[PDB]
Amino acid sequence: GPHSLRYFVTAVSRPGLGEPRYMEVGYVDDTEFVRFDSDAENPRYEPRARWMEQEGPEYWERETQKAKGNEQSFRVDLRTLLGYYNQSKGGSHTIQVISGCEVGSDGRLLRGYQQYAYDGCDYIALNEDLKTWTAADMAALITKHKWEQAGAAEYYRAYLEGTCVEWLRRYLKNGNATLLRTDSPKAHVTHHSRPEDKVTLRCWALGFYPADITLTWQLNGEELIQDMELVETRPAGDGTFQKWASVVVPLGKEQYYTCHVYHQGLPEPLTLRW
């Protein structure tokens, strides 16, 4: 199947408390594998997955130097934006960036992207063509004009088609035992009483990988996606994921409702009831 390499970057100013906090977190698919945090006492890029023990000391030195350079560029960006938006230097502001590439089962590039936000709002983003940028407001238009004269998109496109894809392939090879594995979900149903002769039925799916999964509740062969409540799929602390979905039904009729679980690790979907 397809795989992705993504880097989430965040810069947060804190007037009166020193330099901005800067963080970088990298993921291969939905597994955290590297991290940089300016608030550690010896900021260094560090491994977050066991298989990264396969990289040599030079890899860590290079990533650390890049992170320190990035930290300085975003510090400048925070000041620049105060100017574009005519804001004071007394408040805290945030810049966020998501960069990544995705390849197919054969390892060839499917798509690439880079999007920026300021104070939680779209700022500027690379178009699908990997050649031009699209700006959300007049401040980002100034940035767009600067980047067009500097050839920023061409440099990023080179990273996507070369570096990004080549290293993603390497990580999938080195960490194959972890990244290409499949852990099957184990499910169960809990029961809770409520006011007005009704009951809450909650379907749980535990210990699975990859994260993509589908949980549904059915009544007479029909899905109840509407009156159903749920939580976003979440990490469970050991590299696996979990999720739950519930529905409210009449007391004494619980046996007519069934939970269905679909996942890569389930040759045949699971069907269960209270």
Partner: peptide, 9 residues
């Protein structure tokens, strides 16, 4: 391998 040079805004 992380992006190397984020252009200034």
């Amino acid at each position: 391998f992380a992006p190397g040079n984020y252009p200034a805004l």
